[model samples]
Target: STIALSEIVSVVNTSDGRLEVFGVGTDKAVWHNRQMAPHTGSPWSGWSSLKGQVTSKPVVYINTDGRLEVFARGTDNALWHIWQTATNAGWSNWQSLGGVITSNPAIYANTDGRLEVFARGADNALWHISQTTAHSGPWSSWASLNGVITSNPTVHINSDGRLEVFARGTDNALWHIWQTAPDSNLWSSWESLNGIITSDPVVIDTADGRLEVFARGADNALWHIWQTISHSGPWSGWQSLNGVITSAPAVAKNCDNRLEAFARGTDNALWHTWQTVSHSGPWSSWQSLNGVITSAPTAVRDADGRLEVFARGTDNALWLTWQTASSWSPWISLGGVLIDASAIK
Candidate 1:
């Protein structure tokens, strides 16, 4: 049987302030649909396909040159990647970066602007590859970071400008490896930040250069760790905000640098909590946004600097809720789209 496409959407903002919505499923084609113009609520150009023989959410990034890059694991489990030949233009055919990865891949750009991909090997080791230069590659040969991660990995750039990747380890603890120096291919040995997490880890480098990483605990609650100092040094150990969340957390930061995290509560209603301060402080308790969402909530900042969130409603329509300076808009449906993941995930 073939796999169906997912409703979990990724919305990207281009330099022109245009928003592009990406969706993937089994035609196994990946769809890239963009706003007809450059703002929220602008009409879309409809869906276009970049047929990829793959089975995972395509990890996407905007290269320093403004080209869009896409990466996903192929049916054979090797890394397959593609990109726009030029900024805001057409795509290249799928290029295999060649790693027999077991988890969905994570992509990031080095401080000097080269792109990199990271994944777990079937051997249970963390492996990675990076671009030879910004936007152009023969990606570097896959190298091992040598950790036995049990979940997919996520990458965050440090304030000091080095790359860091976080993954759930064999001990079910939060473990990470980072560049010993900014843009360096050399990585420090794996270090466990220690959390009893049940989901993949995600990190936020706050405006003040502090790092905050959040995940769902085995207790079905939201949990986190943060840099005791902005960007480096001591880490505040894992702590709970008492969220009672059921899905992995999604977060968006305001223009001023404060962060708001989204979660799907036990009732499947859209709920959120946020940092009371821009860089450091306690987080607010859960606030209900009210929706019977079926997938993990995707929170993105609109071009105007407001948080606009997207998710699949039970009825198979594309739904969204966005924030204004003082409040949030009601949940609104964009239209019907096939979200096979409800039955597929």
Candidate 2:
């Protein structure tokens, strides 16, 4: 029915169901919608007004209090978070988080059960706020990490309870830093991992104990840097695979602990790559699909060990398909909800 603008989409799975909140127009107001189907059926049922000129994507996280926080840049260019605990309930009026935020907030639940928000400050420096538990008050003072943040930082915790923040610097190089738990003040200095990056990095723990950071390069190529928990040399060297990657790659740990990455190719198709506990190579040729995609891809592990990839299709509709056992499933188009039609009547 309606095609949203600016390709803004953020997804989160709540206790009730998965929700995708996005910016719908140049008007800049944020809109809320639910993913109740794979291709067709229900519309983005309930529309909520998040009055702001959302220039970038919004971030969603389930707070320690079991509520969801919608974080985005407001018209004032400050960071704002709106909380909601019930689908039928209205969200709390936007809360002033007090920073001239520049990018989508990066959120993750640390191994310690604490919730943290990381964003690039107006000065281009990295800043962060954390709560001991979900939705709790008394958030720690904002801390600045080294260098300016050029994109939304991607975060993932290692098995040992350390937090990693990865982002592209203004120079188009990949830079990252980490903090080990048992002590919060000791954060590793930023490491300049050389790579030409154009998108936010996506990190997930592989079968071993370390983390893998995936990003799209200047050539729109999909590249990655990995580290094993031995803590030797800090991180592995950069590796490049042949594919015209344009969006952040989505990775999930299967039951067997293997890590799988799903991404959109420049050819307008979905492609995948995976690595096991001991063997990872060949980068398998791209799996061209039958459609052109408009949205960055996100892959999640269903109740089963299988992985599902979701994307916005060329028609501006949502598309979903899964990988099972070892075979790819057929693509399914999840249609869009037209928001302007009702106003016309």
lDDT of 2: 0.64
Tens-digit per-residue lDDT, 108-192, candidate 1: 8888899888888878788999999876887788899898887778898888888899988877888988998887877888998
Q: For candidate 2, lDDT tens digit of each residue in 66-140?
A: 677777766676677777745446677777677776766788776555678878787777788877553565567
Give per-residue lDDT, candidate 2, residue 159. 66
Q: Count the backbone clashes (under 3 Å) in each candidate.
A: 1, 8
Worst 10 contiguous positions by lDDT, candidate 2: 336-345
Give all candidates' CA lDDT scores: 0.77, 0.64
Model 2 alpha-carbon miss at residue 203, Å? 1.0
RMSD of each: 3.3, 6.0
RMSD of 1: 3.3
What's the TM-score of every candidate structure?
0.92, 0.80
